[PDB]
Amino acid sequence: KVFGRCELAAAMKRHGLDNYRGYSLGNWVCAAKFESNFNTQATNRNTDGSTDYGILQINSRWWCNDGRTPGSRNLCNIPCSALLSSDITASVNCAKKIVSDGNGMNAWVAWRNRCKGTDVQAWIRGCRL
Ligand code: NA
Ligand SMILES: [Tb+3]
């Protein structure tokens, strides 16, 4: 599923990401926009053999099992395919565990490089919330 900006903002608000670990909703929408362009089926193969999956491009090295990342973990205890569903529940729950790590939203490279320090509230501007 390919979300619209305000449609995802509402879906993410409904699943508790607004101010989760102190990160306002706009941070989450901005991160999803640049990680996946709001596409739940987005995947990106990394040079270490791992793959990033879903709306927030969650990586198989630590967070999910895809059966093809040599030396990996599955801390969200899910198959990586669960991060590609039209229902964003699994992606939100695993994102909650990632952001609870010592590095917070810095875990998402696109968030750190394109969202952090910006006027992120602009990402929820004009949205039904
Ligand atoms: Na894994
Ligand atoms: Tb850590």
Token pair of 64 as six digits:
């999910």
Distance in Å, CA 64 to ligand 1 centroid: 5
CA-to-CA distance for 69 and 54, rounded, in angstroms? Answer: 17
Method: X-ray
> How many angstroms separate the CA atoms of 83 and 8, rounded?
15
Ligand 1 centre to CA of 105 (Å) is 20
Strand partners, 79: 65
Radius of gyration of the chain (CA): 14
Element (H, E) at 53: strand 51-53
- What angle is formed at CA 35 by the lines to CA 29 and CA 36, rounded to 5 degrees? 90
Which resolution, in Å, applies to this structure? 1.4
**Domain edges within the chain:** 1-129
Tokens of 94: 């695993």
Instruction: Answer whether 10's CB lies under 8 Å from 127's CB.
Output: yes
Close Cβ partners of 114 (under 8 Å, ≥ 6 residues apart): 30, 34
Give the HSE-up count for residue 40: Cα atoms under 13 Å, Cβ half-sphere: 20
Cα–Cα distance measured from residue 98 to residue 92, given in angstroms and rounded to the nearest whole number: 10
Q: Which of 56, 44, 51 is nearest to 98 (CA)?
A: 56
Catalytic annotation, pick one of 35, 48, 66, 119: 35
Q: How far is the CA of 36 from the centre of ligand 1 (A)?
A: 20
- d(C-alpha 118, C-alpha 30), whole Å: 10
State how far the Cα of 19 lies from the Cα of 70, in Å rounded to an integer.
35
Domain covering 1-129 in this structure, CATH number = 1.10.530.10
CB-count burial class (<10 Å; 0-12, 13-18, 19+) for 122? exposed
Q: Is 35 one of the annotated active-site residues of the chain?
A: yes
d(CA 65, CA 128): 35
